[PDB]
Amino acid sequence: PGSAPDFSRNPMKKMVQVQVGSLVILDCKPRASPRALSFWKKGDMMVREQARVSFLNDGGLKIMNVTKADAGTYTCTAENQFGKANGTTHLVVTEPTRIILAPSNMDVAVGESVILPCQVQHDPLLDIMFAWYFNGALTDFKKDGSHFEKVGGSSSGDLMIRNIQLKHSGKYVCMVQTGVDSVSSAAELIVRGSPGPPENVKVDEITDTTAQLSWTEGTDSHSPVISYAVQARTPFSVGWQSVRTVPEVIDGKTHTATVVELNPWVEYEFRIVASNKIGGGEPSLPSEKVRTEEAAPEIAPSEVSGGGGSRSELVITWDPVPEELQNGGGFGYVVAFRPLGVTTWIQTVVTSPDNPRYVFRNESIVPFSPYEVKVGVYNNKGEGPFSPVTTVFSAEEE
């Protein structure tokens, strides 16, 4: 044996970083036969045993509740019969990283855009790494792009959630790493939406003007249903349009209703829209296409008139009855006329409604004479009313 102190087997760390208020122990274990005595200096100055400072059996230095004042250069000088040796450690005391603006806990509707901040104050000697966790899993959110953006620049970890969806509900955790040190703060986002589309839309008890609708409630968007509304589509409707129901307003607990004021002999599809306090929901898939029962026509034509024409003519004219008021197939008109004073009607059936105009021409038609005229309606299911009688004059031409 016999050898001076030798730090090559057990060198003192070049540099040690500790958080303010932490505990630090600088090692000083050289190899030497016999064992070497040690002492510590901070810079030029000998370390004095003190309140938070003490000399350990293994030649180490223990400092408690470190301040930035304790930072500096500590050297350990060991001496043997055969010489002295020195080792140096630089103590860096750094402030804690602290999160200054953190995610808020939120209850928010789908489609909204929110910002979960994560600003930190940190000691400038250090570098920081931001990380987000979603329901406990590390993520940078880039696989769900178009819903997430990291905003604020390289110094910030702020997270923007765009057009938030139900699947984005959960615990969010912003974590800031600094070397081996770490702070984080968590918040919970609960997301609520419009109800899901109602399902299983069913139509029964079809009449000429009514139908019973039934349906089952759609997916829970985490806010209860307060209301149901009904829409319908026909060849005549400009897309989907609201329909009147009985009850006038349908409860969130009411899954059946009567549609009213439909037109007879029209084709219909129905859908249902659920609402909650968050907003109006996605419409159901449409019901089967059904047709209402046909019925006798009930509306006679308006503005029956006429007059003029060439020799021996009686011209009769009226307003067409709109298709949706025809109530059934094979709709047509019935023109009835008679000389004023005469009681027997002559009538003809007008099979095609295409042109609401009828001309009688023969020698029995007396020039410029008063005729009583009425026009009625019928379809495959029955006869409808006649218009009020009016007076039109035969042609004046002879």
From Swiss-Prot:
**Which compartments does it reside in?**
Cell membrane
Similarity annotation: Belongs to the immunoglobulin superfamily. Contactin family.
Q: Does the keyword Ubl conjugation apply?
A: no
Query: Where does the record place the Ig-like C2-type domain?
Result: 5-94, 96-190
Q: Give a GO cellular-component term.
A: side of membrane
Q: Could you tell me the superkingdom of the organism this chain comes from?
A: Eukaryota
**GO terms, biological process:** cell adhesion
The chain's disulfide connectivity reads: 28-76, 118-174
Its recorded name reads Contactin-3
* Functional description taken from the UniProt entry: Contactins mediate cell surface interactions during nervous system development. Has some neurite outgrowth-promoting activity.
Keywords per UniProt: Cell adhesion, Cell membrane, Disulfide bond, Glycoprotein, GPI-anchor, Immunoglobulin domain, Lipoprotein, Membrane, Repeat, Signal
Domain Fibronectin type-III intervals: 197-295, 300-397
The tissues in which it is expressed are: Specifically expressed in brain. Ectopically expressed in tumors expressing endogenous intracisternal A-type particles (IAPs).
Q: What does the subunit section of this Swiss-Prot or TrEMBL entry state?
A: Interacts with PTPRG.
Which residues are modified by glycosylation? 65, 86, 362
Which span of the entire protein is present here? 406 to 801 of 1028
Which organism is this entry from? Answer: Mus musculus
Region Disordered: start-end pairs: 281-311
